[PDB]
C-alpha cells in the first residue's frame, strides 16, 4: 500500500512510521513545509502508526532528539514515539478490509488529516487548536498537549483494568476532535476501507 505523507504546516516536521517493533519503509524523514514523502507499507501490516515529530536535532548518523514524538533518539524510527503525538493508526488487509483511525490517546502535537486516495471510504481529521486550548495540567513544556494517562498514570486514565469511563480530560480531546479516539474505551471512530487501499496523511490540513 502507498502512503503519501504531506507536511502542510508552516514549520518543519520529522515524519515517522513504525509498527512498534520495526520501521515502516525508511521509518522517518525530515519534511520541510510543503514537502511530500511517499512510503510503501507491506500488505497485511497490523498496528502501524504514522506521526509527526517537532523540534528535532539529528547528527550525521541519524541520532538526536525531538521535543515531541521522539523514538529513542533515531531519525529512522523502529519503535513508537514519546507522547504527545497525534496518531494515524492503521491495520491493512485484515480479512479483506483496511481499518484506519486517528487517535488522541497518546496526546496531540500536530493537527492531522488521514484520508484514502482510492475509492470506497471516507477520511478522518483532527485539526482543532488542541495545543492552544490544552488544559493547564496537560500542557507539555516541549510543546503539545499530553493525554491524562501519560501525565497522571492512574488505572482510570490508562484503563489498565479494562474498565474505565470518560474523564474531564478525555472529554476535552473529544469536544475538539470528535472523530478521534479520546480514551482507550471510546466509542470507536475507526473507518473501514477496502483491502489494499492507498492513503494520504496531511499534517496541518487547514
Swiss-Prot record:
Keyword Ribonucleoprotein carried by entry: no
Disulphide bonds in the chain: 9-204, 56-66, 71-77, 121-193, 126-177, 134-145, 149-158, 159-164
Keyword Signal: yes
InterPro entries named among the record's database cross-references: Osmotin/thaumatin-like_sf, Thaumatin, Thaumatin_CS
A GO cellular component entry from the record: cytoplasmic vesicle
Pfam families found in the cross-reference section: Thaumatin
Alphabetized SUPFAM superfamilies for the sequence: Osmotin, thaumatin-like protein (SSF49870)
Keywords: Cytoplasmic vesicle, Disulfide bond, Signal, Taste-modifying protein
Gene3D superfamilies: Thaumatin
Entry's localization field: Cytoplasmic vesicle
Top-level taxonomic group: Eukaryota
Family stated for the protein in its record: Belongs to the thaumatin family.
Record function comment: Taste-modifying protein; intensely sweet-tasting. It is 100000 times sweeter than sucrose on a molar basis.
Name of the protein described by the UniProt record: Thaumatin I
Organism: Thaumatococcus daniellii
Phylogenetic classification of the source organism: Eukaryota, Viridiplantae, Streptophyta, Embryophyta, Tracheophyta
Amino acid at each position: 500500500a502507498t502512503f503519501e505523507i504531506v507536511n502542510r504546516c508552516s514549520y518543519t516536521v520529522w515524519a515517522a512510521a513504525s509498527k512498534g517493533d520495526a520501521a515502516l519503509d525508511a521509518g522517518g524523514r525530515q519534511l520541510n513545509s510543503g514537502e511530500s514523502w511517499t512510503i510503501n507499507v507491506e500488505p497485511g501490516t497490523n498496528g502501524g502508526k504514522i506521526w509527526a515529530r517537532t523540534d528535532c536535532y539529528f547528527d550525521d548518523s541519524g541520532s538526536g532528539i525531538c521535543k515531541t514524538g521522539d523514538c529513542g533518539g533515531l531519525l529512522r524510527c523502529k519503535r513508537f514515539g514519546r507522547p504527545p503525538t497525534t496518531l494515524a493508526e492503521f491495520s491493512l488487509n485484515q480479512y479483506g478490509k483496511d481499518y484506519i483511525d486517528i487517535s488522541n490517546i497518546k496526546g496531540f502535537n500536530v493537527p492531522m488529516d488521514f484520508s484514502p486516495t482510492t475509492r470506497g471510504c471516507r477520511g478522518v481529521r483532527c485539526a482543532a487548536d488542541i495545543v492552544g486550548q490544552c488544559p493547564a495540567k496537560l500542557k507539555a513544556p516541549g510543546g503539545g498537549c499530553n493525554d491524562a494517562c501519560t501525565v497522571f498514570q492512574t488505572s482510570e486514565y490508562c484503563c489498565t483494568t479494562g474498565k474505565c469511563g470518560p474523564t474531564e480530560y478525555s472529554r476535552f480531546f473529544k469536544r475538539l476532535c470528535p472523530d478521534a479516539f479520546s480514551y482507550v474505551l471510546d466509542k470507536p471512530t475507526t473507518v473501514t476501507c477496502p483491502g489494499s487501499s492507498n492513503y494520504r496523511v496531511t499534517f496541518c490540513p487547514t
